[PDB]
């Protein structure tokens, strides 16, 4: 068997993504029914930059698969510093059955996956956040049923990891994806091109616009994210793209709202939207647990 | 209907007795209760690290079948509202154990979270330590009601407050001996006096260490702080002279860490009256009992 | 029972070391067949300086014995600062069944072992790396069989923890150990004397030389380690020319991380003589065997 990895959303085909999302629903119903890591077998969970919420979901999910997560956070040097990435992959492959890694550049994830003899999962990177989008898709399916043909609009910084993963993971699910963002913060054209190509296979589509009202019109799902990872109002370009009540009122009447969290209330999203009946952000956060477990189960049995 | 444990008197006298009975049962049979089998998660969050709090809660949770997710010292409230954090945590874990500074943050967390919240240690109270202390006293002396306990040193800190509230809840006559600038918060002292009326207990605050030692069944101290700035406390040192004024079978407690030569001497801490190591062990058993009890009422 | 510790390689007798290494092979074959820590019981894994590869091997090994590792990284209050190491050891002994510690000076390990009522294990220290050498010996045995009478040569910094442990652990196994190192980086004289005395009981021997080529001739095993002060060590590089002077079926060991191009070349590291990846894996099995063995004697 070829060792399978999950570094970006389109690493799964449409049929494979459906398998993972079905497993995510099964594991939400029966969270300790799959024990591929019984022993326990180990899974490495490595953070080049800390993300506490990413750690809750993986550390508990791995335990519920019977395994033991070995968590390495930023306070432990950095992978690649005092020995080669390739040497690190070879040793980790002797201790664990999968490697979950939060890092920056995609080329590091690619290099890890090409040498490691166990599955590598992108927990969060500069370019993609594919585990979050699996959780988003599970949440949408819970609220609306079939994903094919839904219209999803993302608002704010369209150049970030969530914009890229909503494009790739969304069109893989057959969802018509719109990114609404100011012209200096648009999807990477290579990512957009890959999303357009995948969308041809699923009947989906890709739209990029700087007109937030047009992007909201008739949408089934509205998504946003913090505008920056960290005087001058540097986020001024994004404020017209705030997910507020006026924007939500332009979408379909049964539309839902997603936000990967943490939220900066009053910036990219308002209290009224976050706390209103369209919000699915709390189920979405919970589904990180289930969708990541499903991904691990699926990768381990193909690898 | 979700119960929390933020300060000692959050348990009634009857409820405290239930938790302490469970603590003795779990010490005998440490893996006999598995309410967190799965594993289910419990959050263990430190705004400031504590090694003994980490060992006792992390292993206790594991022995209940659970998995502790331990978060060390971005601080809660900085990247998102405490209320948003409380909602996300409630989807991931069955209880939240939190070491933080101000009591108002614990109150805020408990008012929003839909799972039990436990104060692992705060500026104002250390109620899990006092559960361990009460378990230790009971196994050395039997019935708690009517015992005389004196605490010495900094009478304004979390241990003084919790020994007052938790002690009188158990029916113990509690004395705090401290210099006048370091006495119990009057609101806490009043709450302990009111609770003592239900249990036959009493509250005494004094600056006379020798009077407080006389007739005591249990002597307790704690580090004085967390130029001799601690000079005010040195007359309140728990030493052999002070111990010799107490009952001949008195025992000595100290929440740890100890600064030997300051609040307690080597001779007392390593001598036959010391119960400090059993007391430390009982952090594990008493906190396990508390979690079992809160989980079944929530 | 006498509580057994493992702070340096000669804390095991020759017969005891053979028992641990036999157990390591058994546990490599059947990794979850021994569950002395079921419950879970706890094991402390404490780092004064982080070592992620020590963390992986111990944390998963403890889990595979059925236990729960409580892992403490650097950046909490360094042990010894807010209470004595002895007090820390006495409290840890009430929470866990063994203490695994990566620290600096040997006197710190001695301090905890002096009062602990559970086994204390040196995970890695300034003076010794005895768990790595157990893994090394397991690796050598599974490729070459009987250890007595083999020839092992270590190259480079002969004053560091690996040189010391290869001396002590090697002669305990009956191996003729050579340290090839430059002046100013030679073994500590008390360690050298202890290894010479232990070699008398096993038929082993100790050689210390600046002649790297002579040290390679006839060797079954060539070992090196990071040099960190680079100029003195260049003649001791483990390169293809040096390896060719050894036995035709010699194997190469290196406690990771390797600095390729410095103490070892890519050709050696990635060639057919390299046993470094099996060596790293065997930290898991050898440490699990050590824990099983210490627990059942303590």
Numbering used by the authors:
A (entry chain A): 0 to 229, 235 to 307
B (entry chain B): 1 to 73, 76 to 228, 236 to 307
C (entry chain C): 0 to 227, 238 to 307
What does the paper say about this structure?
The L-arginine biosynthesis pathway consists of eight enzymes that catalyse the conversion of L-glutamate to L-arginine, appears to be attractive target for anti-Tuberculosis (TB) drug discovery. The arginine biosynthesis pathway consists of eight different enzymes ([Fig fig1]) all considered to be essential for *M. tuberculosis* growth *in vitro*. In this work, the ligandability of four enzymes of the pathway ArgB, ArgC, ArgD and ArgF is explored using a fragment-based approach. In conclusion, using a fragment-based approach, we have discovered inhibitors that bind to novel sites in ArgB and ArgF and to the active sites of ArgC and ArgD, which in case of ArgB show on target activity against *M. tuberculosis*.
ArgF displayed a melting temperature of 65.5 °C with 1 mM L-ornithine and L-citrulline showing a positive melting shift of 1.5 and 1 °C respectively. Binding of carbamoyl phosphate to ArgF slightly displaces α-helix 2 when compared to the apo structure. All fragments keep α-helix 2 in a position close to the apo structure or move further away from the position this helix occupies when carbamoyl phosphate is bound, albeit very slightly.
